[PDB]
């Protein structure tokens, strides 16, 4: 049932343009947020938005607006890789490659070796979407802090010596770099 395309950090005018182009070339449905059907995420400015992260997590193409301008002139969807934001988001190309090379439904394994995490319901981004991010990267999330060996986000409970209390940036940077970052920098107070 069709694939979706989503715009992020996109100026109004460029949005209009994209709507036109997609209207002309077909093949895509415009969506407001990255979901299971999304395969392309177009960005006006290379900023790390939720859509960008989610798009990386699902192995989508994370591209610059230009891709839509050349596609319109050539009369069809062209090579995405030339417009892929690999420099700002090294994980984009990697995850995409994994997703395509994947035999059957793809699912990330970035947080496979990680222990169960508790994500603060006061976290930024919103705990739901941040948990989504965790699960799309093969992570595990408990609703109970007591089971977690890693707690992410604002937390004023008793601090166990064995537990790791980290910021959301640990997750975010890990997804961006596609390498699990060193917790030492992301230690909360």
């Amino acid at each position: 049932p069709t694939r979706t395309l989503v715009m992020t950090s996109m100026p109004s005018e460029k949005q209009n343009v994209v709507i036109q182009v997609v209207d002309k070339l077909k093949g895509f449905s415009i969506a407001p947020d990255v979901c299971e059907t999304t395969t392309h995420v177009l960005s006006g400015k290379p900023l790390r938005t939720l859509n960008v992260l989610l798009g990386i997590a699902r192995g989508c193409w994370v591209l610059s607006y230009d891709w839509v301008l050349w596609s319109l002139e050539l009369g069809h969807w062209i090579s995405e890789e030339p417009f892929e934001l690999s420099h700002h988001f090294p994980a984009a190309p990697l995850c995409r490659s994994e997703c395509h090379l994947s035999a059957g439904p793809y699912r990330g394994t970035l947080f496979a070796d990680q222990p169960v995490m508790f994500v603060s319901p006061a976290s930024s981004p919103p705990v739901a979407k941040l948990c989504e991010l965790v699960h799309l990267c093969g992570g595990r999330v408990s609703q109970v802090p007591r089971q977690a060996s890693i707690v992410i986000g604002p937390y004023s409970g008793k601090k166990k010596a064995t537990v790791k209390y980290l910021s959301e940036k640990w997750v975010l940077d890990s997804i961006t770099q596609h390498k699990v970052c060193a917790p030492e920098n992301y230690l909360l107070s």
């Binding site: 950090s9 900023l47 790390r48 938005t49 859509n51 992260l53 959301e168």
Partner: peptide, 6 residues
């Protein structure tokens, strides 16, 4: 409002 950057 523009999408937040994290």
């Amino acid at each position: 409002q523009a999408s937040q950057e994290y």
